[PDB]
């Protein structure tokens with residue numbers, strides 16, 4: 001394997017795998033029903049990302065897409081990852097603040113549109129249309145961030161202090177990290193092609209590990225995931 | 230873009246997009262938890278259909294399927310739309326009548342079979358087998374209509390009068406509009422090829438806008454979506 | 459159709475179809491809300507398997523995968539079946555013992571990984587990597603079996619005696635039958651190629667009918683699916 005980005009795919013694979021194992025072992029010896037929900041959701045996230053990084057590392061999760069008169073390597077497995085992991089991450093946030101079902105459905109639905117349209121944009125062969133899908137996806141992302149900041153922050157402040165403050169930290173982490181993804185896509189090989197694939201891959205790896213394992217480390221060490229005992 | 234059906238794809242795109250915006254703005258300023266559920270479900274429907282009409286308009290959601298000794302344009306994106314939107318529409322109906330979970334699972338499951346087998350039939354290269362899948366899908370549709378008429382009508386009449394009467398209207402709309410889809414498929418380019426694709430596309434566009442935006446306009450203007458206040 | 463395995467695909471198709479009809483008719487005349495849930499879940503399982511056996515029989519659910527320097531017939535439709543049916547079967551078990559939501563999410567998630575990685579392994583063109591995916595999938599399966607034996611058996615014994623004893627029987631059936639699948643894959647055409655496809659197909663057919671129709675016959679004749687009346 002001589003793809004230059006292989007090193008970042010290997011490191012992502014390793015870090016997701018180690019993250020999954022840590023959460024799995026940490027979650028052993030938890031009986032609180034509420035805490036079990038968070039452990040289950042949060043452990044699945046890097047477990048799924050592990051499998052999809054491994055598929056990229058082994059070359060399964062890569063296809064060639066012709067656009068701009070070239071054969072462009074597109075790691076389609078990222079979207080398969082994000083389709084399942086990003087709603088789980090939003091579920092962690094929503095459960096934390098005890099969001100109502102309708103809000104959860106809107107968030108997960110907007111998230112599916114965001115990832116779905118990003119995959120279409122990534123596979124689209126007419127260059128200028130790629131950015132049409134990027135814009136729709138980014139609009140869906142803005143909707144999600146809107147809800148997290150101006151709906152979830154409303155109900156969280158009415159929750160327990162440990163819930164309010166854990167939510168606020170995870171909210172901020174999410175807004176910052178999630179916002180970088182459309183930027184990397186736009187400047188990387190899926191978009192304008194300014195940043196080469198190997199650096200794009202490093203950037204997504206840093207984002208993915210932070211948004212998944214970092215997020216989970218903050219969440220799962222907090223007392224907000226337990227019922228008041 | 231010189232595909233003659235492009236005009237109907239553009240109009241569908243526009244009407245779904247406008248529908249989505251109307252529901253989104255209308256749903257702003259709703260705090261009732263029950264009404265939020267309906268707004269969320271109903272707004273997602275045309276939002277999803279928007280993306281899939283746009284994919285057809287831009288040519289992404291189209292493939293060529295050889296059968297009957299010809300290369301037949303098959304808009305596969307319709308099924309991707311219907312897979313997600315048709316269960317959401319059934320969820321609107323089920324929540325309205327407070328259906329039990331087992332009935333909801335049966336309906337959504339039968340609906341997945343209906344769309345799944347329709348997609349297989351649409352992609353199948355042996356001409357006579359296409360109609361085998363059409364028959365299975367239509368049997369799944371009959372099951373759904375059975376449940377809506379002879380199960381949901383039973384519990385709705387026990388609900389609030391505004392729930393009973395809003396359900397009955399949406400039920401009738403659904404049965405009529407949904408029944409036309411297998412007919413259009415059978416006589417159109419996916420089936421017997423009597424009606425040319427451009428007219429088939431107009432017909433599905435009229436059905437889709439009615440079953441989604443029309444449906445949602447009836448539902449979201451009714452008082453049945455709010456708790457009794 | 460001269461594929462030698464066609465006879466087992468036809469018989470599986472027939473037995474799933476007959477199973478579905480039996481459960482459908484049997485479930486007519488059930489009003490208990492709890493029993494309705496089980497009937498809905500259990501009837502969907504062979505209905506889905508029916509469609510996917512039929513797709514294999516008609517040749518839709520078959521692709522050719524080059525590995526080991528040969529064109530290998532891979533029935534990919536099995537995974538499409540298993541992706542939806544195996545979580546439904548686990549849902550039957552979990553509802554029986556009234557498992558908490560977090561445990562259900564872990565089980566369904568691990569199950570998706572198990573089937574997802576098996577499909578990747580089945581489609582992978584580098585021969586030695588196929589067994590990497592097989593090992594990950596089998597690890598996910600071991601996690602599921604662990605939970606069923608050393609978590610579900612814990613709460614079931616605290617349930618009604620008819621629930622405890624119906625669970626224990628279905629648990630044992632599941633562990634035995636589910637464990638055979640990775641073995642058949644490993645020795646069959648997807649793996650080491652010791653057992654030819656036609657015998658592999660017979661083996662999966664016997665397993666599938668037992669794990670689905672057999673399972674459902676035990677479950678749906680038990681009094682554990684009803685509330686105490």
Ligand SMILES: CCCCCCCC/C=C/CCCCCCCC(=O)OC[C@H](O)CO
Nearest residue numbers: 195196198199200202203204205206207210
């Ligand atoms: C939190 C613990 C870690 C903290 C740190 C995290 C850093 C993550 C990102 C690094 C970007 C690296 C960018 C490397 C750019 C190399 C550009 C290059 O090689 O340029 C040569 C080219 O020919 C002409 O530009």
Ligand SMILES: CCCCCCCC/C=C/CCCCCCCC(=O)OC[C@H](O)CO
Nearest residue numbers: 424425427428429431432433434435436439
């Ligand atoms: C509710 C507000 C709107 C109300 C109205 C909704 C109408 C929707 C459907 C119209 C079908 C149009 C069918 C057009 C058929 C044209 C056939 C044609 O061109 O035939 C020539 C051919 O060479 C030989 O048949």
Ligand SMILES: CCCCCCCC/C=C/CCCCCCCC(=O)OC[C@H](O)CO
Nearest residue numbers: 653654656657658660661662663664665668
């Ligand atoms: C429960 C009611 C039914 C009870 C019974 C269920 C049996 C299911 C499995 C049978 C395996 C059959 C294996 C057949 C193997 C044939 C091998 C063969 O043909 O070998 C020739 C070859 O050239 C050199 O090995």
Ligand SMILES: CCCCCCCC/C=C\CCCCCCCC(=O)OC[C@H](O)CO
Nearest residue numbers: 017020027036040043560561564568598601
């Ligand atoms: C190098 C190591 C790589 C990583 C290892 C292989 C990953 C895929 C395999 C198995 C998934 C196992 C299940 C994953 C989900 C577990 C959910 C959980 O922790 O559930 C706790 C809950 O409290 C319960 O009731």
Ligand SMILES: CCCCCCCC/C=C\CCCCCCCC(=O)OC[C@H](O)CO
Nearest residue numbers: 108109112113116117120123277280309313
């Ligand atoms: C309640 C839950 C709501 C969930 C809402 C989900 C909405 C997803 C919407 C749009 C994206 C669909 C993208 C589909 C892309 C398929 C691409 C594909 O498979 O392409 C294969 C090949 O390259 C070409 O045929």
Ligand SMILES: CCCCCCCC/C=C\CCCCCCCC(=O)OC[C@H](O)CO
Nearest residue numbers: 102103106110140143246249256265269272
């Ligand atoms: C021309 C315009 C085209 C259409 C616009 C682009 C469509 C895709 C983009 C964003 C989806 C936004 C989210 C869609 C779902 C919103 C759900 C909703 O309304 O939720 C209300 C609920 O009460 C909350 O708690």
Ligand SMILES: CCCCCCCC/C=C\CCCCCCCC(=O)OC[C@H](O)CO
Nearest residue numbers: 337338341342345346349352506509538542
């Ligand atoms: C509880 C929820 C229950 C949900 C129940 C869902 C049941 C779906 C069943 C059958 C349709 C499956 C259709 C799969 C079609 C895939 C076609 C495809 O991707 O084909 C690619 C290419 O053309 C060839 O390899």
Ligand SMILES: CCCCCCCC/C=C\CCCCCCCC(=O)OC[C@H](O)CO
Nearest residue numbers: 331332335339369372475478485494498501
């Ligand atoms: C040869 C025969 C082959 C098999 C027949 C064709 C299979 C696919 C067609 C229809 C699926 C019908 C719906 C399947 C799910 C029914 C769920 C159910 O039984 O629900 C009971 C519940 O109590 C309700 O409230």
Ligand SMILES: CCCCCCCC/C=C\CCCCCCCC(=O)OC[C@H](O)CO
Nearest residue numbers: 048051080084566567570571574575578581
């Ligand atoms: C809460 C619910 C949790 C659910 C957890 C699910 C996790 C699935 C993880 C990994 C498998 C993904 C496998 C994706 C395989 C796609 C293969 C494919 O479509 O390949 C087409 C073609 O052969 C090549 O491009």
Ligand SMILES: *C/C=C(C)/C=C/C=C(C)/C=C/C1=C(C)CCCC1(C)C
Nearest residue numbers: 118137138141178181182185211212
């Ligand atoms: C664990 C991984 C996470 C949190 C991934 C998040 C990914 C995104 C927020 C992706 C967003 C995109 C856009 C808003 C537009 C362009 C395409 C995407 C999919 C990269």
Ligand SMILES: *C/C=C(C)/C=C/C=C(C)/C=C/C1=C(C)CCCC1(C)C
Nearest residue numbers: 347366367370407410411414440441
């Ligand atoms: C918003 C879109 C809606 C309500 C679409 C409904 C679609 C159907 C009821 C499709 C039904 C079909 C059959 C019953 C058999 C042939 C194939 C289908 C998928 C067109």
Ligand SMILES: *C/C=C(C)/C=C/C=C(C)/C=C/C1=C(C)CCCC1(C)C
Nearest residue numbers: 576595596599636639640643669670
């Ligand atoms: C109705 C069908 C059932 C219960 C199918 C069960 C299937 C499995 C437990 C499959 C398991 C696999 C492995 C553990 C590794 C190799 C690949 C699989 C998918 C065959």
